[PDB]
Amino acid sequence: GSHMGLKIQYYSRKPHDSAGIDFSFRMFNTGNEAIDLKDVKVRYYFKEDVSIDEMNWAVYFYSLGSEKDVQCRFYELPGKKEANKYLEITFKSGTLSPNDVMYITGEFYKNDWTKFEQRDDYSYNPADSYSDWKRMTAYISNKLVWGIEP
Numbered sequence: 700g701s702h703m704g705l706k707i708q709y710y711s712r713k714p715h716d717s718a719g720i721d722f723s724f725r726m727f728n729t730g731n732e733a734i735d736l737k738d739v740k741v742r743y744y745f746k747e748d749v750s751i752d753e754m755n756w757a758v759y760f761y762s763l764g765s766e767k768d769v770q771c772r773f774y775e776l777p778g779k780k781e782a783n784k785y786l787e788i789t790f791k792s793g794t795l796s797p798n799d800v801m802y803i804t805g806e807f808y809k810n811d812w813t814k815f816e817q818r819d820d821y822s823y824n825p826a827d828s829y830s831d832w833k834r835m836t837a838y839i840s841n842k843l844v845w846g847i848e849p
């Protein structure tokens with residue numbers, strides 16, 4: 700009984716052209732040790748020509764505490780054919796015991812209110828139910844534990 704593990708499931712009911720990108724997801728502790736969410740980050744990858752400072756994000760719900768405890772930031776991802784941006788989600792608090800699940804809800808937008816095209820976004824899963832989603836990644840202490848980077 701000696702390893703940590705996470706798994707992400709997510710889906711978006713937004714149409715492929717959308718003002719908001721929904722990054723709401725759930726995450727399970729699949730290992731056999733409790734996890735401090737302060738050590739965890741998650742990435743949602745996409746493609747956009749706008750600068751990271753031309754987008755804004757919001758988190759509306761966090762099952763393990765206040766929504767204020769979920770902090771996000773946009774980053775550039777250069778030199779990759781499959782994506783050129785990610786939103787990284789981090790946590791100020793929260794604990795997940797083995798087999799427990801957490802949820803967040805959140806969306807991001809362009810400052811100029813123009814629409815995103817999501818068909819070229821690596822992490823987009825247009826669906827109406829949960830399944831394991833390998834195109835969002837999760838890390839513990841900066842080590843990759845779930846998913847596949849672009």
Ligand SMILES: [Ca+2]
Binds near residue numbers: 815817818
């Ligand atoms: Ca896009």
